[PDB]
Structure 1
Amino acid sequence: KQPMTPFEAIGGEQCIEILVDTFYSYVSKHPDLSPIFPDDLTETARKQKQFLTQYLGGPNLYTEEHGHPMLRARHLPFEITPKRAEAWLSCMEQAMDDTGVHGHIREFVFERLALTAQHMVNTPNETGEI
């Protein structure tokens, strides 16, 4: 009896569509994030839906088109501070709230994302964070 994939567990394609569209809504309004993103977030949102789908055990949509994610490498030119990693996760938390993602699948997905976001950090903190 097949357990559901995390992708299935979270609600599948329909949930990822709404989560990511909602997510980048928060990103576009966040002062710590919006400046480093492209002005139009459409292509970014499209790509993120492909990534999260495959990331959660759905079809390999991202790799099929774009090749290996190698996300840390792809984020190297961008100023990703621990502060911005925190803003990213904050927006995702709010998107998950808005999209009704809860329980064990929420904790599963959020904890993976938190680990990934930490991996992306490539610039040290501002004064105060020691």
Structure 2
Amino acid sequence: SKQPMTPFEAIGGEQCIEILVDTFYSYVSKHPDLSPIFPDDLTETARKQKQFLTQYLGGPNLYTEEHGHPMLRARHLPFEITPKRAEALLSCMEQAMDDTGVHGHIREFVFERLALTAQHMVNTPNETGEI
């Protein structure tokens, strides 16, 4: 009978998603591998990401209800996403999780999903020095 928590619930629901995503882009805007390629004001980027991660983790379909199918690989096609930038993005997410208290099984679950997805986003080989 008893419903398991959706991953969204397990992480702490809306209130946690808001904080983690805001802290996440705080690190993104201060990371030299990431600042240049994002929009200058990350407000609307963070709004879409809160909607996306909400439904990515099993909450309301907030993202697809507004923007349509995420098709993230297609949407990231024009941006220079190297492996180095994928690992930097993920590093910013790691530091935001520590800052917002995301730990244990739900942390390892949400992070591994995110690592895979960022691998799907890479669309540029690395610079010399990554053989």
User: Normalising by structure 1, what TM-score?
Assistant: 1.00
**Aligned residue pairs: how many?**
130
C-alpha displacement at 1:101, in angstroms?
Answer: 0.2
**Residue deviations 1:35-68 (CA, integer Å, cap 9, x gap):** 0000000000000000000000000000000000
C-alpha displacement at 1:125, in angstroms?
Answer: 0.6
Cα distance in structure 2, aligned partners of 1:23 and 1:75: 18
Equivalence for 1:108: 109
C-alpha displacement at 1:80, in angstroms?
Answer: 0.1
Structure 2 spans left out of the alignment, 5+ residues: none
Equivalence for 1:4: 5
**What percentage of residue pairs aligned between the two structures are identical?**
99
C-alpha displacement at 1:4, in angstroms?
Answer: 0.1
RMSD across aligned positions (CA): 0.3
Cα distance in structure 1, aligned partners of 2:50 and 2:112: 18
Equivalence for 1:47: 48
**Residue deviations 1:91-121 (CA, integer Å, cap 9, x gap):** 0000000000000000000000000000000
Cα distance in structure 2, aligned partners of 1:45 and 1:34: 14
C-alpha displacement at 1:128, in angstroms?
Answer: 1.3
Equivalence for 2:123: 122
Cα distance in structure 1, aligned partners of 2:41 and 2:49: 14
Structure 1 spans left out of the alignment, 5+ residues: none
Cα distance in structure 2, aligned partners of 1:39 and 1:31: 13
**Residue deviations 1:73-103 (CA, integer Å, cap 9, x gap):** 0000000000000000000000000000000
Cα distance in structure 2, aligned partners of 1:128 and 1:29: 24
After TM superposition, the runs of 4+ consecutive aligned structure 1 residues lying more than 6 A away are none
**Residue deviations 1:23-44 (CA, integer Å, cap 9, x gap):** 0000000000010000000000
Equivalence for 1:24: 25
